[PDB]
């Protein structure tokens, strides 16, 4: 149900806008599920 509205470029890792970097969380979704 929850969707993303991040108007950038998505790659496996525009990609970082213009000097704006998005960092991943330390705990992944699988780890939170665990």
């Amino acid at each position: 149900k929850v969707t993303l509205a991040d108007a950038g470029f998505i790659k496996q890792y525009a990609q970082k806008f213009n000097g704006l970097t998005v960092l991943p969380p330390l705990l992944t979704d699988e780890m939170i599920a665990q």
Partner: protein, 48 residues
């Protein structure tokens, strides 16, 4: 390749690749949802 470019006065730094966007006959470049240029029309070949 990562190059500097100047396309008919539009300047910047980036990697140029073949695009699948279809520009109208009069359009020279495009911008994304936040008004930053993300595509150009080559002034000599008209490739996007």
């Amino acid at each position: 390749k990562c190059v500097n470019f100047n396309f008919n006065g539009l300047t910047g730094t980036g990697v140029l690749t073949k695009s699948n966007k279809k520009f109208l006959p009069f359009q020279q470049f495009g911008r994304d949802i936040v008004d930053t240029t993300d595509a150009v029309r080559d002034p000599q070949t008209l490739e996007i």
